[PDB]
Design goal:
Two copies of one chain form a homodimer. Chain A has helices at about 20-30, 80-90, 115-125, 140-150, 155-160, 165-180, 190-205, 210-215, 255-260, 290-300, 320-330, 370-375, 400-410, and strands at about 10-15, 35, 45-50, 55, 70-75, 105, 205-210, 225-230, 265-275, 275-280, 315, 315-320, 335, 345-355, 360, 375-380, 415-420, 430. Chain A is an alpha/beta fold. In chain A, a hairpin with a 2-residue loop joins strand 3 and strand 4. In chain A, helix 3 packs across helix 4. The PDB classes it as ligase.
Chain lengths: ~425, ~425
């Protein structure tokens, strides 16, 4: 529409993360005017390679590789100043120059202070110990800062940039309260405030009014804006497999709340789905395969922590979660990834429905107890038993692979626009 | 679209609340199939009158008056079981029968426990005292529960409905942690858990899968779904005049995150705007009138707390916040209310821009310090000096009133569909 303005493009994980959505973002960031993030998530990282050089992004948008585009961090993101610059400098020393020239931070973003990471790397203990339920609260202090936001007692970039006395004084009252809720919490206010006053000036030239920055972007001449979704649908604070979830909305709604743009300014929303299901840590897993198949999907897929080495749990594709992810996100197109991992299988199983106590339920269970109780209903399809890593067109994929694809499109109701069969860009076949 | 399904209708406050958006909701709830809430907010109340009987709603959707419709509470709402039933029974005794027959609660909604209200009615003190910054943390325990959600250490309806031992045990670990963060916090676990086990069975027949309940609603035959926005744009956790804000997203994005529906399932979004600006409590107020005009707007408008009696601060309409509210919500039409309050004025002033340090800025300041510093740029318009309370058509409004209306439509870019000149339905003139 001429009144609506430009409609942003989004990329979101459709399962439990690690779907490989960075290859879609990377593919799309090429001709994008603005690349951004709207919610923090797990703060997971993404590796992008350009000219032999390898970059590692966590907080910064992956499209910052494109020096002809603008990278934007939304208000819905919690940021750790040292974390940010430590990440920026690191890449700066890898070839990423002039980044400070194309990065803009929304002044409405909340700050993750050092003591937020402290209490975080403190609760996990008292929360677990001996034999609790180690949800695995990523010690990035994401949750602690999200609570300050809730208590309206937290601080944001705009405050750090305003009068420093009021801020410094507000920083003190916040740290005090924290020390009052956690006595075994050491801080050193003056030292941190001093380091923050340093960050204020260092980050000032990049901060701007996020809401106005976006409104103008999509109401001026036609621009192509890309948004990188945090993790995946089932790791969404509200809709994920709670409590084994992130503190952020990792679904399409978070794009509106994380950027300050109305739903009409949202266009294509791609759901990144892996040809099979993976997941990390404790929690229910309906299609999990603790057997030869799982080991295979784990080996051929290299399904393990990139920093820890922890193996990810593997299972058959699951349409129950896939459709659920869709009800919430309203995908316009999908990116089916790692289909090649299955080139070896003789026949592939895919879950199509859930039966609770003998009955077939049409919804995705919200609680762990129920979710762990569902018995999966399967559909066995024949495999293509052929190498697809070389495919570069729909016509290349063998007849059974094409069927595996239509199967996913049909049962989801969303068309597949990308089929992934490798690690390179060429390996991400575009179907239309 | 035939694929999209039905597009929900939303009503949201465009300023600092108290705009009178309940008269729009009430007007629209008449022919609605489903009426709902997606975010808690301040939990403010709304009074609806039917047949001499007067109802008071806080948590329950105001459309529950319509016995031919379905009332739905979304996952994005925090609920206090006793608060809910105390409110439901009260109205039940006022004429509202069979309500339990048309109310559905999303099982993904978080629970506000008694100790959440306790710590809330405990922090306000330690947070303020002598002479702090009494933000006015409404002692409903809304923030405390929103932090538990953040810490992923909180509970929801679905958990209360699942295995009670695991829940009861999880309730205990949560209350413990709280008592560990606040020593002067008394609880009585067994007593509360016992009362909760009572609520579980009492509320079970109304709980359902919220996401699936909505997906089916807008993907089955054409339905008219209405959503009541929590408070107002400037009381939005992310976009409001932080920290003097609510713990919820009170903007359009919260409809997606509070209900689990994609942006395409969102249709008309009405912004309710008062013919002048009001606000309660501490905080910056650009167009505030501490003079004869303010007293007038306060008197003719009955601008005071409905339970406390506290007078609300009054000022001229402010287009700077109005446009800001729009950038965020993307209103399709507005409801201009209380225009009659101005029938008496000889000439009305309305703020059109903000100038910071001599310069005209195009954005709405994010921080208090800056916001308090802006000098308002005004546009003086002539008043109509006539009684408009009897108007029932556009053609009734005098020439200057019509101008006041076009003025708001032009500078906002959104058309006015309702002009309010009274307290009754007939007084809410429809322009198209």
């Amino acid at each position: 529409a001429a009144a609506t303005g430009s409609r942003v493009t989004v990329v979101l994980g459709a399962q439990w993360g690690d779907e490989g959505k960075g290859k879609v973002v990377d593919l799309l960031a090429t001709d994008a005017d603005i690349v951004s993030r709207c919610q923090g998530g797990n703060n997971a990282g993404h590796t992008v390679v350009v000219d032999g050089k390898e970059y590692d992004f966590h907080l910064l948008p992956s499209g910052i590789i494109n020096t002809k585009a603008v990278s934007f961090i939304g208000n819905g993101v919690v940021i750790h100043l040292p974390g940010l610059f430590e990440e920026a400098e690191k890449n700066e020393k890898k070839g990423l120059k002039d980044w400070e020239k194309r990065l803009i931070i929304s002044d409405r973003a909340h700050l993750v202070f050092d003591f937020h990471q402290a209490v975080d790397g403190l609760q996990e203990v008292q929360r677990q110990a001996q034999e609790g339920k180690n949800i695995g609260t990523t010690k990035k202090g994401i949750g602690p800062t999200y609570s300050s936001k809730a208590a309206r007692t937290g601080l944001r970039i705009c405050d750090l940039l305003s009068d420093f006395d009021e801020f410094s004084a507000r920083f003190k009252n916040l740290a005090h309260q924290h020390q009052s809720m956690f006595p075994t919490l050491e801080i050193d206010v003056e030292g941190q405030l001093k380091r923050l006053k340093g960050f204020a000036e260092r980050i000032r030239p990049m901060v701007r009014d996020g809401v106005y920055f976006m409104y103008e972007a999509l109401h001026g001449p036609p621009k192509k804006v890309l948004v990188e979704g945090a993790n995946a649908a089932l790791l969404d604070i509200d809709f994920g497999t709670y409590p084994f979830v992130t503190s952020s909305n990792c679904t399409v709604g978070g794009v509106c709340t994380g950027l300050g743009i109305p739903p009409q300014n949202i266009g294509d929303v791609y759901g990144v789905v892996k040809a099979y299901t993976t997941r990390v840590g404790i929690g229910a897993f309906p299609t999990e395969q603790i057997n030869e198949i799982g080991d295979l999907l784990q080996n051929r897929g290299h399904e393990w922590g990139v920093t820890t080495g922890r193996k990810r749990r593997c299972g058959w594709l699951d349409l129950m979660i896939l459709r659920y992810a869709h009800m919430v996100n309203g995908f316009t197109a999908l990116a089916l990834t790692k289909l090649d991992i299955l080139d070896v299988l003789s026949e592939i199983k895919v879950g199509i429905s859930y039966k609770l106590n003998g009955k077939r339920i049409p919804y995705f269970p919200a609680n762990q107890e129920i979710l762990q109780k569902v018995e999966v209903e399967y559909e066995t399809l024949p495999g293509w038993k052929a190498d697809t890593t070389g495919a570069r067109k729909w016509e290349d994929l063998p007849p059974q692979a094409q069927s595996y694809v239509r199967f996913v499109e049909n049962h989801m109701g969303v068309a597949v626009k990308w089929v992934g069969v490798g690690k390179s860009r060429e390996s991400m076949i575009q179907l239309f």
